[PDB]
Symmetry: D2
Subunit: 459 residues, 4 copies
């Protein structure tokens, strides 16, 4: 395992504390054995998500302080529009308060657009893998969310360069089965969060887009972790060995018609989202009409001016290769600590998190008992580390998936490699108990995005 030094130094700290074992047991009981319902005061190192927990730079805070809070025509709106043109070559933007706000703006518009001419009676979205909010918005609008990630993603220990790729054979099969007139959009998720933060190759994005254009299908790039994807393309595709990260990004967005983005990920923010559209003015106009009631007026989109300002700066910082090398290298370091100790993980590690394969760590659990959640809860009790489940629990409707990950999710520029060692050493310490204590049931199950507020029972 190799430690890579921060390409920055620390300018402001935030205190953390280790709650006592008694506190942790009490807190997990009070939370119904669901870490989503734990208070932050009961958590030491928080690995629930890399979303919105990032550390900003002094330049981002400075941008916030001079942000323009105007209701209409904020300076920072125009700066953000210019930044989207620079990075993606897209001519239209709509800010949103975060990624699922961007989805709520755009997906219903794309559906109604497709329903023109009386077609799309059996509407579907197709993705390498829809994230949970993404699929929820697809289904809330009466559509099916189809996932067709490469089968290589399902072999955790076997290395592959591009475990986020679309399965192209399945893309063509689904077009033939459903018909192009029923495919509202193809969603290219970069990196592929559900597969383990695994990258999509440039050739895969390109072929998917060429197929989509053959059939007149609109392509949306789900862009929360687009810079991590671009880094992997530079690292693993020899064609881009000597390209800049921004050159890689520019090419990626040749292979979509629009993007939805949670800027709470790679743009290094605590809040913020974005819709950008390459050149379809009609869809832009319709999306603006939905933005107004759902998010806010179209030049702030549910964001304070200071957050548009932070986003303009964060979009730049998130592309910096030295930063990306360190960030992705820290995730790799945590994974290598675990793998060298015999802990099974999705290999190679993705951009933002280490995905621990609990199907191999705890094969004696079925999806009936959510294997990765029993691991997560045991780790929390042992160490005060909070992680999150990316398996049957999150996928929804006991529908068992093809992956049962515990996601040790790593915020950007927050934790050191000594925090990583603490995480790894704590889990490595659980090895005599992975068989003892095990299993979980439901008490309360929401019908949509159940994992966030459900209460569970062990056995």
């Amino acid at each position: 395992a190799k430690r890579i030094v921060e390409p920055f130094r620390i300018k402001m700290v935030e205190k953390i504390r280790v709650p006592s074992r008694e506190e942790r047991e009490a807190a997990l009981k009070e939370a119904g054995y669901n870490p989503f319902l734990l208070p932050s005061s009961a958590v030491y190192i928080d690995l629930l998500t890399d979303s919105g927990t990032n550390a900003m730079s002094d330049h981002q805070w400075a941008a916030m302080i001079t942000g323009d809070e105007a209701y209409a025509g904020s300076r920072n709106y125009y700066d953000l529009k210019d930044k989207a043109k620079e990075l993606f070559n897209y001519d239209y933007i709509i800010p949103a308060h975060q990624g699922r706000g961007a989805e709520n703006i755009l997906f219903p518009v794309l559906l109604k657009y497709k329903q023109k001419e009386g077609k799309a009676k059996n509407p579907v979205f197709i993705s390498n893998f829809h994230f949970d909010t993404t699929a929820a918005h697809v289904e809330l609008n009466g559509c099916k969310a189809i996932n067709i990630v490469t089968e290589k993603a399902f072999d955790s220990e076997t290395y592959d360069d591009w475990k986020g790729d679309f399965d192209i054979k399945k893309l063509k099969e689904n077009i033939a089965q459903h018909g192009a007139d029923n495919i509202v959009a193809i969603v290219s998720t970069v990196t592929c969060n559900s597969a383990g933060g695994q990258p999509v190759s440039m050739s895969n994005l390109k072929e998917v887009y060429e197929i989509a254009k053959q059939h007149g299908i609109f392509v949306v790039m789900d862009s929360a972790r687009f810079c991590e994807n671009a880094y992997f393309i530079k690292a693993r595709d020899p064609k881009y060995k000597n390209a800049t990260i921004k050159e890689v990004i520019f090419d990626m967005y040749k292979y979509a018609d629009a993007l939805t983005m949670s800027a709470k990920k790679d743009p290094l923010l605590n809040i913020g989202g974005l819709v950008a559209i390459r050149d379809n003015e009609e869809i832009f106009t319709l999306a603006r009409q939905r933005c107004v009631p759902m998010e806010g007026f179209v030049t702030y989109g549910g964001l304070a001016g200071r957050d548009m300002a932070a986003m303009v700066q964060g979009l730049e910082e998130g592309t910096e290769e030295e930063y990306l090398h360190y960030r992705i290298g820290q995730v790799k370091y945590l994974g290598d600590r675990l793998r060298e100790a015999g802990i099974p993980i999705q290999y190679p590690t993705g951009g933002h998190a280490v995905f621990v394969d609990c199907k191999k760590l705890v094969p004696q659990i079925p999806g009936d008992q959510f294997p990765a959640q029993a691991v997560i809860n045991a780790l929390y009790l042992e160490s005060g580390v909070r992680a999150v489940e990316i398996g049957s629990f999150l996928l929804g409707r006991q529908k068992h998936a093809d992956m049962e990950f515990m996601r040790l999710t790593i915020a950007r520029r927050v934790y050191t490699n000594d925090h990583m060692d603490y995480i790894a050493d704590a889990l490595i310490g659980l090895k005599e108990k992975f068989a003892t204590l095990k299993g979980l049931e439901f008490e309360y199950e929401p019908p949509v995005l159940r994992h966030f507020t459900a209460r569970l029972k062990p056995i």
Copy 2:
């Protein structure tokens, strides 16, 4: 007119500038004679809205710096829950990114909740006056938005204590006509923004709530400007002359079952919203289920932790009587400068804005040529001040005929952000409008260069005639 001194001093400033007349003429032309299309760089004093443009305190900024950005279980979420219990006596909260986010969380839930009982067959919402976003959410969910403000609100020049009140007679006529089965909720808007920021009396809130309950009707308090409403109750209702602002607020919320709030108004924020529910845990659970896909996880609701932190502090600051007296007194000062010069306004002034009645200023301009927009544009060209139209332009066309809907009032709204502008800025505004008195009679009406089929007020491009 009386100037009331600030109960604070200035700690940080932001430069503003007056573009040259040549630059203002070019900018208005480029914006299609629609100030909503102007960049902020072309605006000197911005009176488009009081929403999200407020100046925060040093304590609010300090709260932001120590805010907890945890995705689940932020320290500031629990502080916000405790604050809602303190102020409103409500037991459940869901943060939202702003007021229309709170509406999107709660209103669909209220409709489905009533549909589930075999009711809401032909559903409606009733308010003293639904704000634009509020009505849009009512209509997006297949319901009609019925507004029944007191008739006193339509006599602009005649003083009344409570121009935001519900018309109780119309409330009963609408209940008889639609039946309680079809009334998804009553929305008590405090202050009543669309009537001119005018207050709703305590006795009116109470009587509306009593009628609603006797009919099984859920009541939502639209609370963006709840502190300004509380101030007017203390100022004008003898029974509350010696009450604290917080005591007034506590009584107000005895007369709703829940609240939706834009915290971009009275809680002195640049972003933020809130749903609070008094004690109906089922509705709270259903609203949480909608919050997750639309806004965010239920302990941040689409806000950064720093903004929940700022909201907890701003909720306190927005109740402070010395601040409210100064804030509402500044609005009154602007109004009295205008009224004393013969400019007709909605009288008395409300909490957050002066509404200028443009019918009388430009009688050569009929309603379908947007008299208030012509005055706003002349004001901008004269001074760099940007105001907003609450008249025929905003009102739109009648779907049945395609013709301009008859505007009951043609208002220019001079909307005042909190703790941002001084009374010398107010004088600049008033002097600019007063100085146009001779020009009013020769202002030209407006027609459409480009009219969108919806939301024309925001993006339509206009031409002088």
Copy 3:
């Protein structure tokens, strides 16, 4: 009286409050009847000083956030060096933590420099008027501080354009009497704080410098309020009617060899100072050698990097004519409110404060009973406004006699921080002082309960008579 609108809007506020009358009486007694010993919690509007109490801009706070805290070679040091070259055409800088630190760096070096040449046998400094800290440093180094302001400054009610001017006849007389060999430096104080914030004309600065150069005498510009001085030159000297403020500043600094600056004044800071030297590298090197033990390493001079960053930005903002017009216009407004009501002031008002002439206002209180302090204390008890004395109390006792020094000027200074208070705060101050019209006669003097052997106005305790 004319109110001039702010060329900015408020972005962050800070609460203030009025202590009750009972609290003000108790507080003044505990402070030994010296407002310098009052806590800020006992003060409503604080007019003790314009030093370090200014409101910064969002750009200044942004500059602080990205400031370089390096001990050696901070980015912001080089930015500050460039800014001094831009504004003054001076090639060398040494930051200092504030103005009296700059004086402590430079004045002992100028003395030693004059001595190493075999001169300065009986050394003196000459100024239009040395500020208190400035004179203290002159005297701590064994020199006499000679003040030779124009006699026009002593006629408070009679308007003059340049009440801060040197008396040129007295300058020549003092050089002839003491000898050029004994004049360590001439200090041109701009504006002339002790005369009432009153400007020095360009022609006066030039003549003083020309005389100095003919004699080989070094000239230091005491530059705390250099932008206010530049504004008055543009306003009152027809030669500069169409010059920019920066053009005026550039010309001013042709008439010194170095500057000492409290950046807590016109550069709009809460802390900060500066030495700049035009081109004498030997004096620069010697000043750096004193900086190291007294202030800090030579690239931060006792300041955090963020404060050098704020100074770079504030130096720019402090030169902006729109801001200066408003700032000086607010001081003028307070002065005109008072003068129109018959209160005697130093007329015209200076840049930063209204100086109320208390010899005229309370002639029944002898100088050694501190007439201006009796007014100040009386104003504080009546209103919670804290002002400061610039008269006998500040002046102290004569060493040769042990008795009170006779003062030419007996001012109560209403000192105005920059961008902090509105003109409605000014009205509060004026109305409070005007309301004391009838009590002015009954005002007692005061007597000492304990007197510092030196620095009595900062730490002494008083009792009424």
Copy 4:
């Protein structure tokens, strides 16, 4: 070597960069082969000092935002006074802009106090080891600075628990030689910076103070790194094994009469200093009288209010044992990386820096050719890391002879700012120095191009040989 995890997480970052070898070559030549003259833009990891380069907490920044900038009576002054009473049990405070400002306030006052008693005819100060600014103020006031650290400090490789201790035999010998009447004060430096950041035991502080009291000698605690010293006492003195850090601090300050503090060290600030006096009100009063001309008014002492606020919070954070364990553990980690690779260091490592013994690394370079500076320059060219010399270059010339003063130790100090760098930064530092092991034997010394007569290490220009 053992890595200790941060008891915090990162909330804000600042970009750093490795200049190219070409850039480093050009920058070092321009800086005259003296890293003190490098711009920070030429430095990758800056180990010049732990003074003022620390990372603050969100709570410290929040305290700054609400800081009271009042010239007299700031809220934060009273908070700081209370904090000094809590931590030290001292009843009087004077803020200062930084540590050498506190020295400038207090040391001249202690001399005058001893002189007016008829004493101090041939005055000296005695310390375990005076830091260079501290000795400079002693000498500037006409006194001799006597250093009497334990001889154990000069055996770098041999462990000892208390390498900062006073040599008690030498203390009694110096009292006998000079006489108590001539000893103005004893200065207890904690930790002993010049000995390698090495701690002073509680029993040593106590015996020194008991000896001082026997003879009527005033004791000052130089307290820049008092929390690091307290940590070492808890770690190494069994009497305090179960004491809190604050309990250790409280006992330490039973053994002084006053303190001078650079708050740019253990209180985790970028600027700030402090004088505190236990109970001698006369010395407090005299110190206040010097504060006014040199630093500022007595309730801010040359600091912005926001910096007094940050100091109140940092004083608390600097005592937290979990933080001290990590901070001191990081320094020990760097030291163990070096020592495990055969690089000689002062062992055990102290609180704030690793001191590399270059007398052992480059024996072929004599002291007057600055062996430690040769190592420092090689490290900079190899890696972009800037370190500082604590050896013959710093020590300077004997004023009697004009030749090199003999250095008892030739240290390269790798000084670590608090909460700024990670242990992976430490690995970069260590790997860079370890990779030079074969180059050391052929490094050449340095000679002068420009040499100040007083403090040549801060500004001298050198050339290789």
